[PDB]
Symmetry: D3
Subunit: 126 residues, 6 copies
């Protein structure tokens, strides 16, 4: 159920990793992925290895949760490629519209929250 297949980063070609991402992200596959396959295939496999290290096939959180965390982060940090990728990832996993919209509301709240958290020095002088 992971983004890339069991042990795919251990392959002797970048093909399995690339195929799984194209397959699981569809139109949301970042433009940089095919470019890595072509110009830095080792870095693409390292990308897959690192992804799996963080999110093992049978880990602490389910795929829904992992995807929504990644989606929230992408939105809060303004990573267009990651927002598109996780939105499509979520669609293919069949995550619900209500869950995706709540994630969006949460990312929006988080950014607002951070401003207040950074406001102490200002509040102190009022």
């Amino acid at each position: 159920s992971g983004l890339v297949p069991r042990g795919s980063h251990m392959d002797r070609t970048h093909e399995r990793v690339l195929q799984a991402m194209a397959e699981n992200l569809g139109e949301g596959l970042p433009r940089a992925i095919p470019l890595l396959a072509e110009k830095a295939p080792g870095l693409l496999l390292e990308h897959g290895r690192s992804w799996t290290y963080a999110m093992p096939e049978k880990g602490a959180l389910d795929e829904k949760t992992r995807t929504l965390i990644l989606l929230g982060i992408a939105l809060a940090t303004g990573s267009e490629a990651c927002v598109k990728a996780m939105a499509h990832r979520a669609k293919r996993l069949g995550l619900s519209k209500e869950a995706l919209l709540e994630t969006l509301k949460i990312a929006r709240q988080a950014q607002a929250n951070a401003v207040l958290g950074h406001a102490a020095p200002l509040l102190e002088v009022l």
Copy 2:
């Protein structure tokens, strides 16, 4: 189970909102919260209203998931106040060490992912 009580942002004093946050965040309560209570209580209630709008008491995601999304975002954006607040929030909810550590690994992966997503213009010229 929410961060602030049912309809607390509708109160005629900021006290319920403040108490619930101090209670639910403990030592992780951001320094700016008490300052808001003192100097801009209306903004503190607006903070609580907005929090509840994004995460209704019976919403699309459970409190564990909401907290981990907020935690991931805080870590990825470097909001020290939000990282401390969500870490304590998670502790009080009894979230597992394995779930928190996986969230940390995910936030770390997300930031690495974003760099690759921003790398297309560079990869294109190699």
Copy 3:
């Protein structure tokens, strides 16, 4: 120097810890800092010092620059900016950050 004195002048307790260090170890950089500041915000320019300060304050809050938030907060108080104006600036920075998340949401909304 006078670039250092003037800054300690209008910032007080909000003077960034890095400013004295620059004066001590990289005076040329402290002068360049003063020069670029004046280029961006000249005397008798397009905006008054109040608006300039509120814009810098808004940005500092939105970007999480602890040193600039404190510095612009003290600067604002020295200029006599009202509590209402400073709190409105904080609400605006808070909304700007929320606004940017919605601005980045098109790719997600498209798939719903």
Copy 4:
């Protein structure tokens, strides 16, 4: 006059908020807004409510100052959708070329200022 009508968040539908934003932002309207109107009207209404809470009619700052603060933040944070929206808002409000260019210079200076603000640990060892 504000970006959206006061109390429009209490409207039966999101129509009034959408029309006001389209009119005031023109070609600068973020593509996300029409999508919210279509798929998450409640969030578009909350967007309007939150906007008017921060910037009420006859508040502490005039629309020119509010717009330049938002534009400065947009440039400093690299929010493309906000830069475009506030530039069009500014144009429609009739803000001067000189004021807008000074805002750009200030946002640029702010980002440079922050780097020096974060330099204490480095200068410390020099």
Copy 5:
């Protein structure tokens, strides 16, 4: 102008869309841009143009500045920087962003 020509010179297809616009509508800002750049990176300074370019490239990637990533990428290719050096710079920027998350994790780790 020559500040504009020189930039189109060493950046080519990677010249930011904003540079010609500045030349057209805010020439004074384009000159200031050129002046501050030279102040930060003078001829015969502390670092060679290769290192300077890789540092700017690393930063652009880490901060998500699309215009600077493209601009520094083209600049690097014009200077003849090797593919290995540019890919190593990308891996480094990627690691720096990962490093910063761990750097911000103390408050979380403390509660485990």
Copy 6:
């Protein structure tokens, strides 16, 4: 020599990675590192593995260049822990005051550069 020993990620415990980081970073060691060693050794080992993957012994760039790139990124992103760590790393490697100050000037210029890079939409309407 690199921040940590090559292949140390395969060590039975995190001890070697921890000792090398403490020695090479000194007082600049982030407080998170000892905590990882105590509570999430696997992540400290992966941190070392990922570090050496990006920066292998005898790679394309020398340690001076690698350190200044990391320092520049740290300053530009406001990562306090990284600024302190790379400043101490630089000092221990014996990097010149002039090189470090030029890196600070470059990071400052980079942040200013980015604002202009994001200004097209605004300049467009001027």
